[model samples]
Target: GEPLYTEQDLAVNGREGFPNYRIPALTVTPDGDLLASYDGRPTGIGAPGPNSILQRRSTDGGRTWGEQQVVSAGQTTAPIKGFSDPSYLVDRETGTIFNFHVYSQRQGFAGSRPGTDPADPNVLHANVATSTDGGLTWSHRTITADITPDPGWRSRFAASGEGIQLRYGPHAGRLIQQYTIINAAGAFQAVSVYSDDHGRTWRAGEAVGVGMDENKTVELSDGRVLLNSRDSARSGYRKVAVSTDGGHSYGPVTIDRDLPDPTNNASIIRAFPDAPAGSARAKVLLFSNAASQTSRSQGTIRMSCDDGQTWPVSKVFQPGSMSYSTLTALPDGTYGLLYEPGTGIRYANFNLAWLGGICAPFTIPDVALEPGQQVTVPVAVTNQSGIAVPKPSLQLDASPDWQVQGSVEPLMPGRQAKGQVTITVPAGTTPGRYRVGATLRTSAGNASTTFTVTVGLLDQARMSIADVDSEETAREDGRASNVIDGNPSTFWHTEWSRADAPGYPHRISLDLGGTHTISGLQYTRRQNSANEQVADYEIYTSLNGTTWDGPVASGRFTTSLAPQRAVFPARDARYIRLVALSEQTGHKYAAVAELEVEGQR
Candidate 1:
């Protein structure tokens, strides 16, 4: 069983402090502390604008969080109307934490309408704050970016929402903030601002050559910066741009059609710094919602092992809707993400085992088999993301005697599929222990796993002729004879006697001279006692007398004296055996009068 954690709501403004809405941004500090920044909009969006930027600290890896502290107040007096979209940066060198948010003042509206912006409001502004005591306390400075009410560039220059800090380059130590401005003509423009001296002072960088909503920046190992921005033009999907000169300027924005656009806010994060340059390959890992452009529903978390060139595998994190996600690699090598808590936030930690590999579909549990038994193993594969995976191949291999039974089949991306392999013990199979491993190969990459089976004596017993006759007639000659006559009323009598064993504990062996293809097994249970309690039996096989295996088949009987049979096509066996494993009545004995085996070319 897996562990489930609780999502503790730290910041609430409604009744009992239950926040009506929250948009959080998180970053891990050098010492492994998680600093979260967000807005506690008690009044909701588009309402009277007194939204405040809040901060919280978690030392125990997000399990328990501290109380929310106000990091930025709209304007000290007169109830400043706006402040939202918080972003954070941890200075690796100084251990300093920088937090910034976009702020704007209320401009009296010209009309008497219920929900309308004033003609010449204070316009959008950017503000900065810092916490020297590791996020426990904070100090604010003057508004950092120019907030002049210039209509032409004012609306277009106002910091839109949330920003990111660069992790590498000459600006390695700088903090970059992103925002969108609406020109007097209503054309939206994207811009960036940075601060070199912590959060004390800041400078506006050149406009990013793209339309932006909420944007984030990641510095590649090759010293280049990649900017991920929400498409405000409503083109659907997020837009991406690369910056060569740090965060100053950007190239043309390209649409990431693979990402989802739900008419709601969304976010993206980088899994690693970047693959080192000059290496045979360079890659960047990205995680985002893959919802259709028209719906906010989420698909899967995609991977780009080749650094955004292409995404092959996407592990579905949430089957439903999720928004604004952030992922960080924990010290334990697992991944921690902070998104909407709807899908059980505390249970969101994922191990590398669950992720498979880059571009590789998620893996189901490994299949189990017995040694020297020819069983057709079926592997279950699924595309965690909702995207259709191309034709994927299942590769199989086994130990010395373990063989492939049939042709391997290609499995469709997202469900249970069958792959046949005929297994046979070699002439001189040394029964002891062995394993069969399978790997699923896709255009993205390969994911492989192994299942183990042990070899040994088939747990079964055969009734001697003497015991059969004694149970039937009490006379040796009568036992030797095959036919016996009795009153039809008392005809349900014991004709054979065999040791009864616990279900799933014994097997009847079939000695095949050598390795042979097998597909199924059959057997009959005879009533040896008055209460004919025989219910079911399991068939197993073995090659080197020491190792045993099975393709178990069970049958049911309604009467005390009755015959039953079961067919299983998925299992194949060479040196097969049938084990009368168990009964529903808890009886300790079983009597089988006949058995048979079947196979294919």
Candidate 2:
């Protein structure tokens, strides 16, 4: 593979003879050419202005295009004023291109007045058109569906972007279009118009929730359909939904915290439709948005593999001001984008391989400790910014008695690093639930996540370690004995005979020797390496290792040099064991540096 960088700017306004270009719809033809479409605004502003659904063709993957053409033109009359919100769909099975847009009369259009004004001046007529010889000519324009919700309920047609044509399953070749409707109740939501007849007719699907608008759709590998919509509340998070029955209905509509909405239009597409679930190549569902909550700037692209569960791979396509973006999967395995950074739809090209890497978001857990005791907290620092971060800083905020300590190493874009924050509960401090955490500020953004650290009045001492036992030994060099040795420099890691682990319940059993009233215990990890960190585990106290009761305390922890402490009700016992459930690095192996129990004998 040779090093490469590519760029191109395709505008629909400027010298195209149109005053403005909004709502870009982009897609790749089966013949490997690119098509870009948008609302050509003649008045330069407002949705009510004289608008036309126009397009341009790019034979070289968006680098350049032929002359611009109007796919759907709007009228200047009272009942037929404008045509806006264009969405595209390519039928590889039929070699036909379908273009859909909303044609409406700009009367008294009280947008977002859910079911509030059937008599309202503004009304919509949803329409579609077809192109046989590519997008060079579009004909057979028809009103395929009346998506306008209840007369008073106030619903509208889909927005501008490419529709997904299902490839696998009973619904293969089905076209799923994206739309936004504001109800009579004033709340908004995302809806869909599907065409099972392959552009013959279109029907509306169910809605996700209020606060959803201007969305994009893609087909998942396991046959499930994924929807990513713009949150209308100007909130920073995108509204999401998944449908197993093609696009007829959707379930489990939720907000993707990883996909932020900068109060504007965002787009997504299946970059690798052939990748199967759980495979390393499964992460091909790519998305584009103004990756900021503060303003319409940061043009960032993120990817997801596990059915849009986590968007780990990310990279900024544009560093400056940007808003309302649409992504197109090029035929050459690279990606093309049409977005409004400032002037018009700036077209750019970059390979999906350039996205490279990004770590999952870090985690912080709640802490529990007894009076006058001290503990080191673990924090896993991941670079989700898709770029290198040098000299990232951290600050501890708590009472003067509780000293906080942690530091992060220089991180490259898409890498992982572990940080440690140690806090001390002074002998004179009051006993109660308190807050303590580190403020991790990097060039990207400051990470602010705090956990509750509780202090109990009853003081306890370290219980003697009679013997240490491990169910599985990952490396003989870092055996179970290394845990009781009280040196974090060494660790007792579960057998990597499985690379990570064969399977869990990775057990680390500790013997306190005699019956003692237990208060709590401290568990530490290795000083270095991220894959060795544990995220979730359970601690159980038993009078005998045979008749062991359920877990007395359980929780999660980030990666760090400090040992995460688990406090439980005072129970007289001689055996204590830890059941490792998951690792912070997403593997099965579990590792611990030291095990210290505090109790009264």
Candidate 3:
């Protein structure tokens, strides 16, 4: 047990001349300093760049660091502009350290139109930069006309790593910051830009999800406010939301199936921020992400004693390529993180005994076969780490020309180790799906878990959404179970409730959760408005989903939200249907956004 943590390389990609240094943003300041921020990409490393926002400071807590200021110096001549994603809020009673960021002139979120006038150079502006002496020197402003309320948005930022201040209830000293916009019908909201006066004025809070992205908050010890977004509707989970009135408003988005998220950017805080709410160290939270729903490397760290409900510790801090992260709760009881493992932004410092190094819980299911199919895949590994562990090996992570083979057995301490990994896909493997994963490693740490693998004919995660003659119980983004929810910004939309309205033919049902040999299905259409757009359709086939059989592929979609494919002629069904007959302006509502079911199983 000698590795309690101490990484460092605080922002280094091409060593300072900046060709990339992505997005991280640690935060400590209550005098225990340790600021750190990012996005110094001088000429491209993603996003519309002309980027520059760098910071660093450590004064003794994050183990040495300092030098590299520049809080917003982006302007590559021409009308080129940039200052991106930095985030941080820290105001423990005015030791002020605000910093939000994003001022991009040539657009980053699509062409970023609309406007909030920071003198409109294509308006995306949302700046802020004050540091009253903790990270030493900085002061810029922009507020984008007080948290932008009109011009219909278009692009907004902040929400790169930190932001939070409400300690406990009734908006105790409010200061939040965690924005993410891009509206004007392009959706992806996730708001909460607060500040009751400690950084002057700013306000904007209702909008916790609509394909959300990059978010973080944390108060809940009864003062509620959770917010952990970055689920641009992909559904590989992570998109919670709580705020009972404190951060201004939020209360619906809840999909965190134990936080899987490949829709990246994560980091929650509050391990003991002045502990005392219901004490036990104020229900300790701490999350950090890139835990793979299929990509963004492993980089875990979980531990959520109860405020976030249940995480029961996890580890694997950077098993590879992790991206965007930032957690900070330091002042001595350690923990300062700031990550992004693609060659830059490092920092680490850890605790909670290096994140309780031992609770290994792994699963890894979702496999769907085809290209030379071979599948065995079982891998379970569970010891919750109270003690005995040693004999858990298995590290596949897929496709290096897929061939797998895993194993695991010694666990005991709450024990539960099941194993079996066969996999084999090869034979020109490349029909799709494949993020794949495995990793168990047991000296009491490392425990990854990704899935998909899919490979050929179909795999909409082996389908199951069964019945829906109507949907949209008044908005939660549609819902006929979001058409198998492989998320296309979610949809199903039918019941517009202007007095129980539900017109058009609209049928929707499926359940190939197991029997297949199919060949026909793939609809995916509603992404950012085309109005109820479903356009004439019909297709059926079943084997007892309450009797249904041949309408067998009849269609007409053209509003082109892309995926269309109707095909048909392979037949063996286990259940399927899709009737939406009209609404590509023939009115009377209906939508669909993702369906996929082309089989062989």
Candidate 4:
């Protein structure tokens, strides 16, 4: 557990009348020079006032840094106007390093008003400056009108860290800067401001989803733009969306439970940018962030070999207080990370060997099991390294009921090994997706992978809605009928209109139509928004519509944005009732997109 990489504190507090240096951003030029930028705050340590963009260059692969120079300066007195959220975009074709930031006179992300004029001091403005001479000089321009023309956007700013340029698509040579805009309703969405013809002009893309904030974009192996964002709702997870047609628009946003974040800024980039899309070298992606859900500590670096679909290797870069970070693949083949270690911005340079073990093609397929049925699940790990590794010890991290039964043999270089594990789904186990983690330990180090097992689940097509106590009739998608409609995009929400809204303890019943043995129920949260997420709930079963038994299952749901399951003793019933007690946001309303019963036919 010693320090894997060497660290050098570039900027700290109490230097040149500056009290704080935060929002660390890093990028490497084609000529092999490393460019690092951050917010130099004199009066306020936070954003929005009396901040200036500062840059420091590292000529010898981050071993030494030059003097701190100002890119954009702000006022030192009252009515403070300054630039913050320093981000960078490097054009490989022209060798131009563009630094993008947000300028504010009287507003930041919270106080900014709706306006696109760059001359207005009260409106949040987007600005970019270029450094052609290896970041020794700069030129600034305000592109507020071109990027953010929406009058309804109250607050907007470019996300901190690094932007990306398209490398392997029809839109190659496109420069994209990630931004977050908040509407007047206090909803935040992530969008991309891109320029096709270099940094001469920029245009905004479609906003991805609500509650997305401080996002960053990376070109995937297939030339698709993967937007990974910080969830403003503090759902203990990061949000992600994919765009196939470059960065113009994105698909639906989904929560990544593997990457836990406390609403903090993070960074992501492809390990090998020039590798072919389908080649093995193109599958690696490097990500950096404060890996926690409660605190911004444990600065961790994770590597994914499947284009970010899964992360199998994670190593802690900083174990203490850490916040925003930036990542760039250096010319010397080592990876360089510029991160805020709470005290100041620290630059760490290390190779993939410092990350313990190398990433391999570790996989486990989805397992299906019925009550009292035992299944053998196979686990495989391939050695992607150049050297052979000793026999790996397999450890299963899951519920105590599920067990592992085998070990993997020694793995040769570029070889694969398989192990067998038996799992017996206890008759009383919950009928839903359960995550199973497989950690492989060897002399090289340890690698972790996860898969899901679904047990005793029922098909939704056989269930039908019986009745509901209340439903919002004003909106077409808010009707109670949407619960069993088998659509994740639609939800059954309680009436929220001024006079028709109902209080807590909303009830929705369903009819099995035939007698069946049921053990549990699955509740899927509504997508798109987390406003009406259910927190506490209870389930009941009935023989007739009028006669109901005791509450079979009652519990509180976690803060996960994924589906939740409730299990109880198996019962033969024709009717079921699911009641919502409260919401996680402490609101009186309740909602559920889809509900299914776990039973045996």
**Residue 504 displacement (Å), model 4:** 8.0
Please provide, for model 3 over 510-545, each residue's C-alpha lDDT reduced to its tens digit, 9 standing for 90 to 100.
887777777678787777678788878989989878
Reference-based lDDT, residue 532, model 1: 33
The total number of steric clashes, by the backbone 3 Å criterion, in model 1 comes to: 36
Instruction: Give the range where candidate 2 is weakest over 10 consecutive residues by summed lDDT.
Output: 457-466
**2 or 4: which has the higher lDDT?**
4
Please give, for residues 277-382, the per-residue lDDT of candidate 1 as tens digits: 5232334465655355665556455666444545544556665656555565556555566555442122245654455553433332333234335454445444
Give a tens-digit lDDT track for model 2, residues 1-601.
3324465666746667777877778888878888888887887754566688888887866666888788878666655466677777888788889888765555322352333233443555556778888877888454523454355446466667788888877988888888777666776667777777877767777766787777778887677888888877755788888788887788876777777777788888777765664444544578888988778889888776445766656678887888878888776777778888777777777875466543334555677776677787777766655567778766778887777777777777667777777778787455455777556666444555467776652222233333333324433666776676644556777666644346555777767767777767677776656776777888888887677766898988767666567888878888787777878867656677777675643
Best by TM-score: 4
Q: What is the lDDT of residue 523 in candidate 4?
A: 88
Off by more than 4 A, model 2? 1-5, 77-80, 107-121, 140-153, 276-283, 358-601
lDDT for model 2, on a 0 to 1 scale? Answer: 0.70
TM-score of each model, in listed order: 0.54, 0.61, 0.35, 0.74
**Better lDDT candidate (1, 3):** 3
Output the lDDT of residue 492, model 4: 90
Between candidates 2 and 4, the TM-score winner: 4
Model 1: lowest-lDDT 10 consecutive positions: 480-489
**RMSD in Å for all candidates:** 21.8, 17.3, 18.8, 5.8
TM-score preference between candidates 1 and 4, better one: 4
TM-score of 3: 0.35
Candidate 3 regions with alpha-carbon error over 4 angstroms: 1-26, 29-326, 329-333, 336-366, 369-374, 377-390, 394-441, 452-590, 593-600
Q: Hey, what RMSD does candidate 4 come out at?
A: 5.8
Clashing pairs in 4: none
